[PDB]
Design an enzyme around this catalytic site. Structure first.
Site, PDB file in Angstrom:
ATOM      1  N   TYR A 204     -33.721 -52.145 -21.784  1.00 28.82           N
ATOM      2  CA  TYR A 204     -34.688 -51.912 -22.998  1.00 28.82           C
ATOM      3  C   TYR A 204     -33.887 -52.208 -24.439  1.00 28.82           C
ATOM      4  O   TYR A 204     -32.560 -52.439 -24.209  1.00 28.82           O
ATOM      5  CB  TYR A 204     -35.386 -50.585 -23.236  1.00 28.82           C
ATOM      6  CG  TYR A 204     -34.378 -49.532 -23.610  1.00 28.82           C
ATOM      7  CD1 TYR A 204     -33.654 -48.826 -22.842  1.00 28.82           C
ATOM      8  CD2 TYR A 204     -34.611 -49.285 -25.037  1.00 28.82           C
ATOM      9  CE1 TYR A 204     -32.951 -47.672 -23.303  1.00 28.82           C
ATOM     10  CE2 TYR A 204     -33.666 -48.214 -25.510  1.00 28.82           C
ATOM     11  CZ  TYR A 204     -32.997 -47.671 -24.642  1.00 28.82           C
ATOM     12  OH  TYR A 204     -32.010 -46.450 -25.064  1.00 28.82           O
TER      13      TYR A 204
ATOM     14  N   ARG B 215     -28.291 -58.771 -26.011  1.00 26.43           N
ATOM     15  CA  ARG B 215     -27.898 -57.627 -25.255  1.00 26.43           C
ATOM     16  C   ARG B 215     -28.919 -57.374 -24.267  1.00 26.43           C
ATOM     17  O   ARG B 215     -28.445 -56.808 -23.212  1.00 26.43           O
ATOM     18  CB  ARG B 215     -27.539 -56.488 -26.246  1.00 26.43           C
ATOM     19  CG  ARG B 215     -27.169 -55.243 -25.522  1.00 26.43           C
ATOM     20  CD  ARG B 215     -26.784 -54.230 -26.536  1.00 26.43           C
ATOM     21  NE  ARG B 215     -27.770 -53.562 -27.246  1.00 26.43           N
ATOM     22  CZ  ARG B 215     -27.667 -52.760 -28.083  1.00 26.43           C
ATOM     23  NH1 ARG B 215     -26.734 -52.324 -28.677  1.00 26.43           N
ATOM     24  NH2 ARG B 215     -28.967 -52.388 -28.636  1.00 26.43           N
TER      25      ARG B 215
ATOM     26  N   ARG C 266     -42.013 -48.833  -2.455  1.00 32.14           N
ATOM     27  CA  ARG C 266     -40.848 -48.085  -2.913  1.00 32.14           C
ATOM     28  C   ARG C 266     -39.919 -48.433  -1.834  1.00 32.14           C
ATOM     29  O   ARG C 266     -39.940 -48.002  -0.613  1.00 32.14           O
ATOM     30  CB  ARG C 266     -41.316 -46.577  -2.920  1.00 32.14           C
ATOM     31  CG  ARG C 266     -40.038 -45.918  -3.336  1.00 32.14           C
ATOM     32  CD  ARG C 266     -40.376 -44.480  -3.626  1.00 32.14           C
ATOM     33  NE  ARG C 266     -39.315 -43.701  -4.261  1.00 32.14           N
ATOM     34  CZ  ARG C 266     -38.432 -43.124  -3.543  1.00 32.14           C
ATOM     35  NH1 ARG C 266     -38.245 -43.418  -2.286  1.00 32.14           N
ATOM     36  NH2 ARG C 266     -37.521 -42.520  -4.264  1.00 32.14           N
TER      37      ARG C 266
ATOM     38  N   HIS D 101     -35.228 -48.307  -2.245  1.00 32.80           N
ATOM     39  CA  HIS D 101     -34.024 -48.360  -3.336  1.00 32.80           C
ATOM     40  C   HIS D 101     -33.639 -49.800  -3.453  1.00 32.80           C
ATOM     41  O   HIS D 101     -33.186 -50.318  -4.763  1.00 32.80           O
ATOM     42  CB  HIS D 101     -32.969 -47.627  -2.795  1.00 32.80           C
ATOM     43  CG  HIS D 101     -33.024 -46.003  -3.069  1.00 32.80           C
ATOM     44  ND1 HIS D 101     -34.158 -45.614  -2.141  1.00 32.80           N
ATOM     45  CD2 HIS D 101     -33.057 -45.206  -3.594  1.00 32.80           C
ATOM     46  CE1 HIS D 101     -34.279 -44.216  -2.237  1.00 32.80           C
ATOM     47  NE2 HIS D 101     -33.414 -43.967  -3.466  1.00 32.80           N
TER      48      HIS D 101
ATOM     49  N   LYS E 108     -27.942 -50.720 -21.302  1.00 33.25           N
ATOM     50  CA  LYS E 108     -28.878 -50.042 -22.147  1.00 33.25           C
ATOM     51  C   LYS E 108     -30.044 -49.828 -21.308  1.00 33.25           C
ATOM     52  O   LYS E 108     -31.043 -50.537 -21.306  1.00 33.25           O
ATOM     53  CB  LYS E 108     -29.389 -50.875 -23.379  1.00 33.25           C
ATOM     54  CG  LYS E 108     -29.907 -49.700 -24.493  1.00 33.25           C
ATOM     55  CD  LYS E 108     -30.164 -50.512 -25.873  1.00 33.25           C
ATOM     56  CE  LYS E 108     -30.552 -49.208 -26.919  1.00 33.25           C
ATOM     57  NZ  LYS E 108     -29.600 -48.428 -27.061  1.00 33.25           N
TER      58      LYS E 108
HETATM   59  C1  LIG Z   1     -29.026 -48.131 -28.208  1.00 32.50           C
HETATM   60  C2  LIG Z   1     -27.868 -47.071 -28.158  1.00 32.50           C
HETATM   61  C3  LIG Z   1     -27.014 -46.912 -29.301  1.00 32.50           C
HETATM   62  C4  LIG Z   1     -27.058 -47.742 -30.726  1.00 32.50           C
HETATM   63  O1  LIG Z   1     -27.125 -49.064 -30.554  1.00 32.50           O
HETATM   64  P1  LIG Z   1     -27.719 -50.050 -31.766  1.00 32.50           P
HETATM   65  O2  LIG Z   1     -27.972 -51.483 -31.104  1.00 32.50           O
HETATM   66  O3  LIG Z   1     -26.988 -49.797 -32.706  1.00 32.50           O
HETATM   67  O4  LIG Z   1     -29.090 -49.414 -32.000  1.00 32.50           O
HETATM   68  C5  LIG Z   1     -26.036 -46.085 -29.409  1.00 32.50           C
HETATM   69  N1  LIG Z   1     -25.952 -45.359 -28.088  1.00 32.50           N
HETATM   70  C6  LIG Z   1     -26.754 -45.309 -26.815  1.00 32.50           C
HETATM   71  C7  LIG Z   1     -26.451 -44.290 -25.913  1.00 32.50           C
HETATM   72  C8  LIG Z   1     -27.838 -46.236 -27.065  1.00 32.50           C
HETATM   73  O5  LIG Z   1     -28.595 -46.229 -25.991  1.00 32.50           O
END
Ligand SMILES: *Cc1c(COP(=O)(O)O)cnc(C)c1O
Ligand SMILES: *Cc1c(COP(=O)(O)O)cnc(C)c1O
Lengths: 277, 277
Positions: free
Chosen positions: A31, A50, A98, A100, A145
């Site tokens: 995300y 990203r 389901r 893995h 992320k």
């Molecule tokens: C998203 C996120 C951030 C900050 O990233 P930004 O692009 O500046 O919003 C920092 N730490 C974690 C653990 C994150 O998931």
């Protein structure tokens, strides 16, 4: 309002998530969060790049180009008439019985995006916030992320319960990042932050702040610091798309220096302002 | 078929997950898998106990008593006419506007449960399987059976494309567990397995096997072993609700002893067989 669902914008009411969506059973997805200032999206290209990078790291292939993704985001902002707030969007590997292991490539990823009205954190930016140290128990791929956020959830809750804004995490007594923000420390006019490896998420705000430091000719050193060193910094602050540059003036009852926002944090906040739409 | 949704049994078609269900945005929830043999649930009480324990570990309060929960499962099984296979059920913190911290104790958890006909893996039990070593990059609370399974997903997929059944994980060469199973090693008639701390999930199958060992007077030592020592074992096998006692005869091209299922593994399977309905 309207929600971005896969490759179309529809009324929230039409969205249907399956119980076997891998995002719901394995947190198998990625995300992004993008801040919108008076109708203008901030660093949208960087956040989209990203999303694709995160997805690549776990081998999810987003069904369409970045250009198209950017267009869908624009539409999402317009249809919801978002003024100031943020767009949240994610991509899961998809829906499949389901198991893995990865499903057959014929399974399409599920994309979800929506908006929320949210003003800039004025009070925090001016007065600073309190924080608390919490042992970093996250998995070893924080550079992704992803939706596996249970560690962040438990950390933030502990912080909230103590009346703190954020939890500053540490692994082996070394400060890594906050539960959802990057941590910076200033000592003798020098800016310090944990380097970008698998221990942290390389924040976009983090990169913007570093650029701002270079612009005001401030030395930047990406070497980690410990909890003991953190409590002795002249200034301390965290960064994230929604927190911008939030000063941390106290940690677990111990004031950072005199407990006021420092001059370097102020200078960086001023430089950051010139970047906002 | 029918799906358990909260405390109702509904047609699968009627079930709808909200985009802001915390299980979908944070993997904020827990789950269990129970095997059903000829219409009877195996060790259901132990699994229900663990579901509540996992839930308690991340402070989710399940709204029904265990007796009520037990009744629902029985109900779910009858309606779907499940003979032999398993029941999957999970509980998430619920639906609430996206925020890391907990929602105010007024938001109710979302419970989902469904069945799947699936035969015992007889061929694997008889012939054994191939495995591969993979670095354990999971978070530090593996004692919670949570929805944050991205680590297990990547590990299992890496094993799958190597033609392996399971990935045996390790932290700095110390064997912990498989991506979704516990690992036991046998050397000179002695049973070895990683102790039950935060590094692994304390399997119910693992505990039954340990009980079986005491019943046939086989010594058990819950101390961890390395990947190097594992390769020098006389016998090796993994356990899980769906895998039962599955022998591992080869790891990364290296046979375990002679590559055939061992005498003690057979003795344990024999004792185990007396436990299932
Ligand atoms: C998203 C996120 C951030 C900050 O990233 P930004 O692009 O500046 O919003 C920092 N730490 C974690 C653990 C994150 O998931
Ligand atoms: C569920 C699980 C197991 C096996 O536990 P059982 O109760 O025997 O099914 C093993 N490892 C992990 C990581 C698990 O999540």
């Amino acid at each position: 309002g309207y929600t971005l669902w896969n490759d179309q914008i529809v009324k929230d009411e039409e969205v249907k998530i399956d119980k076997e969506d891998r995002g719901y059973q394995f947190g198998d997805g990625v995300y992004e969060v993008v801040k919108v200032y008076n109708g203008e999206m901030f660093t949208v290209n960087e956040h989209i790049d990203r999303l694709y990078a995160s997805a690549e790291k776990i081998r999810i292939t987003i069904p369409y180009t970045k250009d198209k993704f950017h267009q869908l985001l624009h539409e999402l902002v317009e249809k919801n008439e978002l003024n100031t707030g943020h767009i949240y969007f994610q991509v899961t590997r998809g829906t499949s019985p389901r198991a893995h292991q990865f499903p057959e490539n014929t399974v399409k990823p599920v994309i979800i995006g929506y908006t929320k009205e949210n003003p800039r954190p004025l009070e925090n930016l001016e007065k600073g916030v309190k924080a608390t140290f919490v042992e970093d128990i996250r998995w070893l791929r924080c550079d992704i992320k992803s939706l596996n956020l249970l560690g962040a959830v438990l950390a933030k809750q502990e912080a909230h319960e103590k009346g703190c804004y954020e939890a500053i995490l540490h692994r082996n007594n070394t400060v890594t990042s906050g539960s959802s923000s990057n941590v910076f420390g200033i000592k003798d006019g020098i800016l310090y932050t944990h380097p970008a490896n698998n221990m942290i998420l390389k924040g976009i705000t983090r990169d913007v702040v570093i650029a701002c430091a270079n612009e005001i000719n401030m030395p930047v050193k990406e070497i980690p610091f410990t909890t003991h060193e953190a409590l002795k910094m002249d200034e301390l602050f965290v960064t994230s798309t929604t927190s911008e540059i939030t000063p941390v003036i106290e940690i677990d009852g111990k004031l950072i220096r005199d407990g006021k926002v420092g001059e370097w944090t102020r200078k960086l906040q001023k430089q950051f302002e010139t970047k906002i739409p």
